Structure 1
């Protein structure tokens, strides 16, 4: 009945990527703010159709909400939850990181999102601080399901063989093996995000034997740059996450049992 409720004003650009651009859209009547992902199909018709498909399945507090999609000619418009706090990346101070209580709360919320995704049989495949967005209250939301896929369907696990993600966040098995389980890969990337949050630096360019920094970690040289700035409790968790063998790697149910994970560190809202 409301005459102008369907109208949305494109106020400002939020960022320009490879697929296209993301714009801030504000409703004409309600003044509700949403983000619109603009992707040129004529300048990928395959990777975007799967992104919409996965987004349709998801409904969680730590996952960027999907409102709908419009197919105006060639351009695909993806209406998503606006996260005003920006990326977790910009909350990480270079070579220092962030306060340990902040990192723990972000990691808690990250695990909550990943648990949900894995429970519905989907893997993100590109977990990194650039893809972890913050809302008005600093709540973490997992974003960008353009590289995501189904790893469990009708209670049968499908092994992955496609190499994707981001090299510094990638698990060693996807560079080493033809086939690999989906879940430990996401777990590994979550560990690299934790390292970044607590040290303000990435441990290695890639998890390979040719990489000196990765070889030092396997040699347990925790006296070196990233690990020496972390602290024993969270480092002990990192020792369990960043395990080369994905079969010996800690699972999320066991991460929730970890000492540092359950260590009281963070207070609530400021007098509220």
Structure 2
């Protein structure tokens, strides 16, 4: 029974470090949206949020301040997270993984093309609409890495250790785009194996050492077919300047492999075939 202007906040979708996220339903129009509620940087988030316009990125509808609390209205992805579609120790069917990977690259290319890096790509932040279309959500760590056609290097460490690229832990400053690419590879690994390969990509983490030594008889690699594994070998490359870029991902054999049948034709409601 809480509400904001014309919307009722009817269900808690999740929780933030500084927020809560609610299902908001418009009393008049019946539209359903998501609303992130922040008690009391968020100015920066809003500027980035207003830039977003792409089918694989959560759209921003506007905001409201009421005393101490900010409300950020956002497109709803009613299917929830990709995280909940990954069966532990299994993953998901390869054709479904490929499709989600396709969508994820489309959203990341978009963001990179407007000079925005998300910086915390992981299945928890990849939401699904009612047709299972992927949407990159939560721009609270996002930042500008290109402005007026000039790249800036990053230096703040942030993200989530099992998804983070090794340069982020090793270098004083690093390029944004390869970091996002690396985390897309860890997502792909999770979709195909239902398990993360390492706690973190550091020289003191055995499982990472094992990967650099190509011990792909170990989990999770041994669960992964040779084609997508060859892509993962190009993505999960320690040196960020040697790592595959998105233009080249789009040329990869597995990325271009036909795997998934299209949806059945929609039901006739009027007229003929």
TM-score normalised by structure 1 residue count = 0.95
Q: In the alignment, which residue of structure 1 is the partner of 2:23?
A: 24
Q: In the alignment, which residue of structure 2 is the partner of 1:93?
A: 87
Q: Distance in 1 between matches of 2:264 and 2:118?
A: 33
Contact preservation (8 Å) 1:5, 1:29: no
Q: In the alignment, which residue of structure 1 is the partner of 2:10?
A: 11
Report deviation, 1:17: 2.5
Gaps of 5+ in 2: 267-273
**Residues 91-116 of structure 1 deviation map (CA, whole Å, 9 limit, x = unaligned):** 00001000000000000000000000
Report deviation, 1:4: 13
**Residues 162-185 of structure 1 deviation map (CA, whole Å, 9 limit, x = unaligned):** 100100000000100101000000
Q: In the alignment, which residue of structure 2 is the partner of 1:164?
A: 158
Q: Distance in 1 between matches of 2:60 and 2:265?
A: 33
Q: Distance in 2 between matches of 1:18 and 1:161?
A: 22
Q: Distance in 2 between matches of 1:142 and 1:3?
A: 27
TM-score normalised by structure 2 residue count = 0.95
Contact preservation (8 Å) 1:5, 1:27: no
Q: Distance in 1 between matches of 2:227 and 2:203?
A: 27
Q: Distance in 1 between matches of 2:122 and 2:70?
A: 25
Gaps of 5+ in 1: 42-46
Q: Distance in 2 between matches of 1:3 and 1:207?
A: 44
Q: Distance in 1 between matches of 2:251 and 2:43?
A: 38
Contact preservation (8 Å) 2:19, 2:38: yes
Q: Distance in 2 between matches of 1:4 and 1:207?
A: 44
**Residues 191-218 of structure 1 deviation map (CA, whole Å, 9 limit, x = unaligned):** 0000000000000000001000000000
Contact preservation (8 Å) 1:5, 1:28: no
Q: Distance in 1 between matches of 2:151 and 2:140?
A: 21
Counting only pairs closer than 5 Å after superposition, residues 19-168 of structure 1 correspond to structure 2 as: 19-41=18-40, 47-168=41-162
Report the more deviating stretch, 262-271 or 3-12.
Answer: 3-12
Contact preservation (8 Å) 2:2, 2:9: no
Report deviation, 1:268: 1.3
The 3-state SS of whatever aligns with 1:216 is helix
Q: Distance in 2 between matches of 1:202 and 1:208?
A: 14
Contact preservation (8 Å) 1:4, 1:29: no
Report deviation, 1:3: 20
Q: In the alignment, which residue of structure 2 is the partner of 1:270?
A: 264
**Residues 54-89 of structure 1 deviation map (CA, whole Å, 9 limit, x = unaligned):** 001110000001000001111110000011100000
Consecutive aligned runs of 4 or more in structure 1 exceeding 3 Å deviation:
2-6
Q: 1:4 to 1:173 in 2, by over 3 A?
A: closer
